Ligand binder design. Structure first.
Ligand SMILES: Cn1cc(Cc2cccc(F)c2)c(-c2cc(Cl)nc(N)n2)n1
Length: 454
């Protein structure tokens, strides 16, 4: 069975949620379902990346980093896949996976996902991970324009797995309060988490009669894309995809053009693994706690239509979009594969202020925040052969990320960007530097005030 078609290579960059969906061209598109979510904190990615920036690695730091990272990441991915999970996105500090099933089956699936989580820690019993799990209703949002598509999962189950994540320490498996209350408590031994309603999993103690293999196989009954039969030994049914122009047209909208060129063998397969000077523009769009997903979707769509238009003007791209706690965030980048223009820093700032101005006027968006940082960041395809994504990793990525969170409502920039721009000082304001989660001495942080006082 020949399986190396372009459509198959494109599908490697996408979850089954997108590959095997069949939904309208309307944007935004929204769908609703139930499932179990898994968030694997891999940090040790942004910790290690800056070790490989040193001269000890003799200009092969990027190639060495992608190698060892994929070694560990791909092992996590294999575990997720063989347990029936769907890896939704990679984000440098973690991956998010989904077990979509009917509500009546969440109880049994939570057990599958807990066993999966425990075997993932088994792979690493320095290098360790933290796992959060949640279960309940999930909303999917698809937004984009006629040639680009993006997706997000939204809902309390998403926010639940967010908070379960941040409690875990190395080797921990934290269950969301709803996950704990929907799970098979007769089989899961838990313990308190101080003044948090989540719980930590200590042991999986099944009845004397219980055989997980038989249990798991019956659970696969409910998995609408688990490989079986002649394809029992495939990690993804997506590997069996055959040419289909209409489907490929839809799927390629989700993938960055430079990635498509590699998939088409018009670019060296190692061209995208690099430690590169870029400028990160991290945009955050905060909505109110009361907002429903049906209001958030149209707002993100309207925001995105402007963001992409400005990014193309100033020659930037969207690398990642996230959402948790009513904040939708766009990881934008300037200066990656063929986009290194001489005045990158000035354009990043003006693009940021432009995005800030417009999105601040979109209804239902209560606050816009943008952090800008410039420096060496790792760029590469991270994951497994069958499931991988282009991702940027580095401390300047994390700095832009916390800038937009710790300095809401304004456009902030780092000292590199400030000094390097061909703009005068009064366009800026030096800021009170704040204690920021796992961030070194930033250097001076600045607000991009603009060309006028008003
Ligand atoms: C690797 N990764 C990180 C995130 C952001 C996130 C979501 C939930 C809890 C967290 F702690 C962090 C996502 C993600 C993917 C999709 Cl499809 N939708 C949304 N909303 N987020 N992927």
């Amino acid at each position: 069975e020949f399986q190396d078609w372009p459509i198959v290579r494109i599908a490697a960059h996408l979850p089954d949620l997108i590959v095997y969906g069949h939904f309208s061209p309307e944007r935004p598109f929204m769908d609703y379902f139930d499932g179990v979510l898994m968030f694997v904190d891999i940090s040790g990615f942004t910790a290690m990346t800056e070790k490989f920036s040193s001269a000890m690695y003799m200009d092969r730091g990027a190639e060495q980093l992608v190698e060892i990272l994929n070694y560990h990441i791909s092992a996590i991915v294999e575990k997720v896949l063989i347990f029936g999970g769907d890896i939704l996105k990679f984000a440098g500090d973690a991956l998010l996976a989904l077990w979509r099933v009917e509500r009546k089956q969440l109880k049994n699936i939570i057990t599958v996902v807990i066993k999966c989580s425990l075997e993932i820690h088994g792979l690493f019993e320095d290098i360790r991970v933290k796992i959060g799990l949640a279960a309940g209703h999930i909303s999917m949002l698809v937004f984009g324009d006629e040639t680009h598509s993006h997706f997000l999962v939204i809902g309390q189950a998403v926010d639940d797995v967010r908070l379960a994540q941040n409690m875990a320490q190395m080797n921990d498996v934290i269950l969301s309060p709803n996950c704990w209350q929907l799970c098979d408590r007769s089989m899961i031994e838990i313990e308190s988490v101080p003044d948090q309603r989540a719980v930590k999993v200590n042991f999986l103690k099944p009845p004397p009669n219980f055989n997980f293999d038989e249990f798991f196989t019956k659970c696969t009954t409910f998995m609408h894309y688990y490989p079986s039969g002649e394809h029992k030994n495939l990690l993804r049914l997506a590997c069996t995809l055959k040419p289909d122009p209409e489907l490929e047209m839809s799927l390629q909208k989700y993938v960055m053009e430079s990635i498509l060129k590699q998939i088409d063998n018009k670019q060296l397969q190692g061209y995208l693994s690099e430690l590169r000077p870029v400028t990160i523009v991290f945009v955050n769009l905060m909505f109110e706690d009361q907002d429903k997903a049906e209001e958030i979707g149209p707002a993100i769509q309207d925001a995105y239509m402007h963001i992409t238009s400005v990014l193309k003007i100033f020659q930037g791209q969207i690398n990642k979009v996230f959402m948790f706690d009513k904040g939708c965030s766009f990881l934008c980048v300037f200066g990656f594969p063929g986009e290194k223009v001489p005045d990158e820093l000035t354009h990043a700032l003006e693009c940021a202020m432009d995005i800030f101005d417009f999105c601040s006027q979109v209804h239902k968006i209560q606050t816009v925040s943008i952090g800008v940082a410039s420096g060496i960041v790792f760029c590469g395809i991270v994951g497994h052969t069958v499931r991988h994504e282009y991702t940027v990793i580095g401390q300047k990525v994390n700095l832009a990320a916390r800038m937009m969170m710790y300095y809401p409502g304004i456009v902030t920039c780092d000292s590199v960007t400030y000094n390097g721009s061909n703009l005068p000082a009064y366009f800026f304001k030096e800021l009170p530097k704040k204690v920021m989660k796992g961030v070194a001495d930033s250097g001076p942080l600045y607000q991009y005030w603009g060309r006028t006082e008003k």
